[PDB]
């Protein structure tokens, strides 16, 4: 199968060739078929060498006023074409054989084959010809309504927003748009990913002739659905007006779902197999547009749009730096841009990199602008004196007195002096000129969350290594448990540890770290104590296994965890004692842990290198008591083996470690009581109460009130009345006035 040249041109010519009792198709059928008028309306590649194509055209039309000569044309053109590496014969190659389709007259205008045509062809479509359509084998070849906003004209003006690194998307769009069935590409991603810039980028490619000119007519128009009542009716009336023009196509830049105002809005109306365009969806809109319909699904091809990388986001922001500077009237630092992109990338979990980067560069810039509102005050004081003096001279002019001698003159010259002073204060006082990187960003982010803000001042030393003391002091006992855990965390530094995957099983008494450590970890690890998520096991055991992961295997069931947990991809998930978990749960944990990913019915993949799970357990009901002469490792191995005998081995094999927790000793009881003092201090030193418990009572109390598998519970009742009622008394006392440190 050849190009459409001399195939479809002929099909059209035949529609229009019903003329002369033609014994067969002659060359003149096509030749005349290659024009709109039997006039020059004359540009074949040999027109430039020796052929008066305008005369050839008149002579061929006059001639009529395959055939044996057409066959010689076909055979010669193709044979020479093969020799010249022109696999299919086009208009610039048909000349090789055009035996019939020439001014075969005395004063002839005849074609060349392997002499000049092969050279003139380079100027024609020529060298860049791999694939199979045509060269627009015609003539010169060698209503746009308000619902069709023209982007290519804006592209031509030069005011559209370019996209960095998204040529693959434009390329794929062109390929899809040309098709008959899967022919409406859609861009996939959340808005902000760069989809709006891609749609605009297409319009730019068109005006810059980076595309074959087809889009010259099939211009980028944007669809403005209009409402402020039914409007689909208008879309249909306009669509008919546009389709009749048959030139331009309507795009969605970022968002489209099925709407109630056909769910496939305007689509059966325009289901003509033409005027293909890029639609645009997100993970959920795709589902709610295309998958939801599932009929027209056969007519779409998603084009996945990734977010720009730090390098690409920085490049667009630096390119756009001039625009932002003009609006902020400040300089925006390049370092600030690099930092804004990087620090937002670390801080924001809510948006794509361009959005979180932009939100930050405007806040950093805004702060410079607020500070720069004025000259780095004394002037204002001078102005206030000027206004005062002005008012006083008003009184001076009005005074109904006998006297520019004294009243008027005094105030007039005082004002003149102050006026010069106001000007001088401005001139010799010549906020911030330019934004900063870490300093402004730390302020913006610290403002938004604070807490060293934790991803700004973290160089991965404090939360990887110093982590051991933070976690241990938060949770007293078995520092070896803590050490194993901090090692698991530091191993992920630079991806030394599998980049796409933490997991621990915590066994022991209550009040020793089985649950306490998971929260302490979230506090340190994410700079967020509420990054810890607790999951009850009965709640998801069997009948509710479907609430752990969304199922639909057998409403919009988000389960209880998939929808909610997904909102925070920076988290510690604490599972209740797993011996209460159903094998389905363990199989789920296994599937989820591998490759670090979310296994659901939505596809909202989470890079789990940003999460960790902690599962408590009491399988080692007696084994945990080995602490009461075995060391950490020996106990660990014993509990590991028993866990293996209960939970699936494959699941268990994805666990970083089995952690030994352990009843606190008196030294440890004193340490947790001490932590209470720190808590009370944090709660009250703010009532301004500083706290020291009389030493006799302090130690006696911590030493006595223990509970082997809870924490120091017996201490509690004596203390609320001994300490809290007393601290209330300190307020009512005044001897041990708040700020002093004495209690019982």
- The CATH number of the domain where 494 resides is what? 3.40.50.300
Taking the CA atoms of 459, 461, 462 and 467 in sequence, report the sign of the dihedral they define: positive
CATH number at residue 96: 1.10.1780.10
From residue 547, how far is each of 530, 532, 554, 603, 647 by CA, in Å?
22, 19, 14, 16, 21
Q: Helices in 36-159 by DSSP H: which ranges? A: 53-64, 68-83, 117-123, 152-157
Q: Is 190 flagged in the annotation as binding?
A: yes
Do residues 483 and 568 both lie within one domain? Answer: yes
Q: Is 562 flagged in the annotation as binding?
A: no
Q: Which residue has the tokens 């970890």?
A: 521
Q: Is 240 flagged in the annotation as binding?
A: no
Q: Is 734 flagged in the annotation as binding?
A: no
* Domain final residue pick, 427, 457, 491: 427
Q: Which residue has the tokens 């998603």?
A: 302
Do residues 47 and 175 both lie within one domain? Answer: no
Do residues 628 and 677 both lie within one domain? Answer: no
Eight-class DSSP state of 434? B
Q: Which residue has the tokens 């590409």?
A: 185
1 three-class SS: coil
Answer whether residue 267 is part of any domain. yes
Q: Is 559 flagged in the annotation as binding?
A: no
Strand-strand pairing, 503-507 and 149-150: unpaired
Alpha carbons 228 and 451: distance in angstroms, whole number: 45
Q: What is the resolution of this structure in A?
A: 8.4
Answer whether residue 434 is part of any domain. no
Answer whether residue 639 is part of any domain. yes
Q: Is 279 flagged in the annotation as binding?
A: no
Do residues 672 and 619 both lie within one domain? Answer: no
Contact (Cβ atoms closer than 8 angstroms) between residue 526 and residue 532? no
Do residues 83 and 179 both lie within one domain? Answer: no
Task: Give the burial class of 329: count Cβ atoms within 10 A of its Cβ; 0-12 exposed, 13-18 middle, 19 or more buried.
Answer: exposed
Alpha carbons 744 and 724: distance in angstroms, whole number: 10
Do residues 496 and 644 both lie within one domain? Answer: yes
Alpha carbons 738 and 548: distance in angstroms, whole number: 50
For residue 697, the Cα-to-chain-centroid distance in whole angstroms is 58
> b/e map of 540-572 (b: 16 or more CB within 10 Å)?
bbeebbbbbbbeeeeeeeebbbbbebbebbbbb
Contact (Cβ atoms closer than 8 angstroms) between residue 505 and residue 429? no
Answer whether residue 473 is part of any domain. yes
Q: Is 708 flagged in the annotation as binding?
A: no
Contact (Cβ atoms closer than 8 angstroms) between residue 26 and residue 68? no
Answer whether residue 350 is part of any domain. no
Answer whether residue 337 is part of any domain. no
Q: Is 509 flagged in the annotation as binding?
A: yes
Do residues 685 and 653 both lie within one domain? Answer: no
Method: cryo-EM
Segment (H or E) for 249: strand 249-251
From residue 171, how far is each of 176, 278, 290, 326, 705 by CA, in Å?
9, 12, 22, 34, 73
Do residues 39 and 159 both lie within one domain? Answer: no
Q: What are phi and psi of 487, to 5 degrees?
A: -70, -40
Q: Is 479 flagged in the annotation as binding?
A: no
Q: Is 512 flagged in the annotation as binding?
A: yes
Q: Is 90 flagged in the annotation as binding?
A: no
Q: Is 192 flagged in the annotation as binding?
A: yes
Strand-strand pairing, 220-222 and 149-150: antiparallel
Domain region containing 422:
378-427
Do residues 609 and 576 both lie within one domain? Answer: yes
* Domain final residue pick, 304, 324, 351: 304
Alpha carbons 93 and 132: distance in angstroms, whole number: 15
Task: Give the burial class of 738: count Cβ atoms within 10 A of its Cβ; 0-12 exposed, 13-18 middle, 19 or more buried.
Answer: middle
Contact (Cβ atoms closer than 8 angstroms) between residue 493 and residue 464? yes
Do residues 218 and 269 both lie within one domain? Answer: yes
Alpha carbons 370 and 433: distance in angstroms, whole number: 11
Do residues 565 and 636 both lie within one domain? Answer: yes
* Count of domains for the chain: 5
* Domain final residue pick, 630, 660, 690: 660
Q: CA nearest 279: which of 261, 262, 297, 295?
A: 297
Do residues 670 and 631 both lie within one domain? Answer: no
Answer whether residue 496 is part of any domain. yes
Q: Is 602 flagged in the annotation as binding?
A: no
Q: Is 38 flagged in the annotation as binding?
A: no
């Amino acid at each position: 199968r050849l190009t459409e040249r001399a195939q479809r041109v002929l099909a059209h010519a035949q529609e229009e060739a019903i003329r002369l009792n033609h014994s067969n198709i002659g060359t003149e059928h096509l030749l005349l078929g290659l024009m709109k008028e039997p006039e020059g309306i004359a540009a074949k590649v040999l027109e430039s060498f020796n052929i008066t194509e305008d005369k050839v055209i008149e002579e061929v039309e006059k001639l009529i006023g395959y055939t044996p000569r057409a066959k010689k044309v076909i055979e010669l053109s193709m044979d020479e074409a093969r020799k010249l590496h022109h696999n299919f014969v086009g208009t610039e190659h048909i000349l090789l054989g055009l035996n019939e389709g020439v001014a075969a007259r005395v004063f002839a205008n005849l074609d060349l084959n392997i002499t000049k045509a092969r050279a003139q062809v380079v100027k024609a479509l020529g060298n860049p010809e791999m694939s199979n359509k045509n060269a627009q084998a015609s003539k010169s070849n060698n209503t746009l309504d308000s619902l069709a906003r023209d982007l290519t004209v804006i592209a031509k003006d030069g005011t559209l927003d370019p996209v960095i690194g998204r040529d693959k998307e434009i390329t794929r769009v062109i390929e899809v748009l040309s098709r008959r069935t899967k022919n409406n590409p859609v861009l996939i991603g959340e808005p902000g990913v760069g989809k709006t810039a891609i749609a605009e980028g297409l319009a730019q490619a068109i005006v810059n002739n980076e595309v074959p000119e087809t889009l010259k007519d099939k211009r980028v128009m944007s669809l403005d659905m209009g409402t402020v009542g039914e409007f689909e009716e208008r879309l249909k009336k306009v669509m008919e007006e546009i389709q009749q023009a048959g030139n331009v196509i309507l795009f969605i830049d970022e968002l489209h779902t099925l709407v109630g105002a056909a769910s496939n809005i305007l689509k059966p109306a325009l289901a003509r197999g033409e005027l293909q365009c890029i639609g645009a969806t997100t993970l959920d809109e795709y589902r709610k547009n295309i998958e939801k319909d599932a009929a027209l699904e056969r007519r779409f091809q998603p084009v996945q749009v990734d977010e720009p990388s730090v390098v690409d986001t920085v490049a667009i922001l630096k390119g756009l730096r001039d625009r932002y500077e003009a609006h902020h009237r400040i300089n925006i630092s390049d370092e600030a841009i690099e930092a804004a992109v990087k620090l937002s990338n670390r801080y924001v979990s809510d948006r794509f990199l361009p959005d979180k980067a932009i939100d930050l560069i405007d806040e950093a810039s805004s702060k410079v602008r607020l500070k720069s509102h004025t000259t780095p005050n004394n002037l204002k004081e001078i102005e206030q004196e000027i206004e005062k003096v002005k008012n006083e001279k008003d009184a001076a002019v009005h005074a109904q007195e006998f006297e520019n001698a004294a009243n008027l003159r005094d105030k007039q010259t005082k004002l003149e002096k102050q006026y010069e002073e106001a000007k001088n204060e401005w001139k010799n006082t010549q906020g911030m000129s330019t934004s900063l990187s870490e300093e402004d960003i730390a302020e913006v982010i610290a403002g938004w969350t604070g807490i060293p803000l934790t991803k700004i001042n973290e160089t991965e030393s404090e939360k990887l290594l110093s982590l051991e003391d933070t976690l241990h002091e938060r949770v007293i006992g078995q520092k070896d448990a803590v050490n194993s855990i901090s090692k698991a965390v530091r191993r992920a530094r630079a991806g030394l540890k599998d980049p796409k995957r933490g997991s621990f099983i915590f066994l022991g008494p209550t009040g020793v770290g089985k649950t306490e450590l998971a929260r302490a970890l979230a506090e340190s690890m994410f700079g967020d104590d509420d990054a810890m998520i607790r999951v009850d096991m009965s709640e998801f055991m069997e009948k509710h296994a479907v609430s752990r992961l969304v199922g639909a295997p057998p409403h919009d069931d988000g389960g209880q965890l998939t929808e909610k947990v997904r909102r925070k991809p920076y988290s510690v998930i604490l599972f209740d004692e797993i011996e209460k978990a159903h094998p389905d749960v363990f199989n789920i944990l296994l599937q989820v842990l591998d490759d670090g990913h979310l296994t659901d019915t939505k596809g909202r993949t989470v890079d789990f290198r940003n999460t960790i799970i902690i599962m408590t357990s009491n399988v080692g009901a007696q084994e945990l008591q080995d602490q009461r002469g075995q060391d950490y490792e020996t106990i660990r191995k014993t509990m590991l083996k028993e866990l293996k005998n209960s939970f699936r081995p494959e699941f268990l094999n994805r666990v970083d470690d089995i952690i030994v927790f352990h009843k606190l000793t008196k030294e440890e009881l004193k340490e947790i009581v001490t932590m209470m003092v720190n808590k009370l201090t944090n709660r009250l030193s703010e009532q301004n109460i500083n706290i020291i418990v009389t030493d006799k009572a302090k130690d006696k109390i911590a030493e006595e009130g223990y509970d082997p598998e809870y924490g120091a519970r017996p201490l509690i009742r004596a203390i609320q009345k001994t300490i809290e009622d007393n601290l209330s008394e300190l307020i009512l006392d005044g001897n041990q006035i708040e700020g002093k440190k004495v209690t019982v």
